[PDB]
């Protein structure tokens, strides 16, 4: 572009699209599970992954992943969630934070237990 054109139209500053829309600014956000089921993932994986349809405090509803092996999460379980998606499960854009509200820690977990909300063992 000529310099003149730049004086005229100027450069267009790029904008940023949040990948975590429902959070509405906040770091984490509280909610209740409406559905708790398993979803098969996209190719080339095969599994029955653990998810919850969750109703936010912003009166939103997101699909959120349940980490760990096994869970105490059910319909009507009050839960806390955090950002970050699960690439193989489209539409899952948030993770459940284990060890908060009616979300337990992973029983028998010994490695990297901060992530899985398990208190330090024997």
């Amino acid at each position: 572009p000529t310099i003149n054109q730049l004086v005229r139209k100027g450069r267009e500053k790029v904008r940023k699209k949040s990948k975590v829309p429902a959070l509405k600014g906040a770091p984490f956000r509280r909610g209740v599970c409406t559905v708790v089921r398993t979803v098969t993932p996209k190719k080339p994986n095969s599994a029955l992954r653990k998810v919850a349809k969750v109703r936010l405090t912003s009166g939103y509803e997101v699909t959120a992943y349940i980490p760990g092996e096994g869970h105490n999460l059910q319909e009507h379980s009050v839960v806390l969630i955090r950002g970050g998606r699960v690439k193989d499960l489209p539409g899952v854009r948030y993770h459940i934070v284990r060890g908060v509200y009616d979300a337990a820690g992973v029983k028998d977990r010994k490695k990297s237990r901060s992530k899985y909300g398990t208190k330090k063992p024997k």
Partner: peptide
């Protein structure tokens, strides 16, 4: 946001 009877509403 009304659930089956949960005192939690959302």
């Amino acid at each position: 946001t009304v659930x089956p009877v949960x005192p939690y509403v959302x």
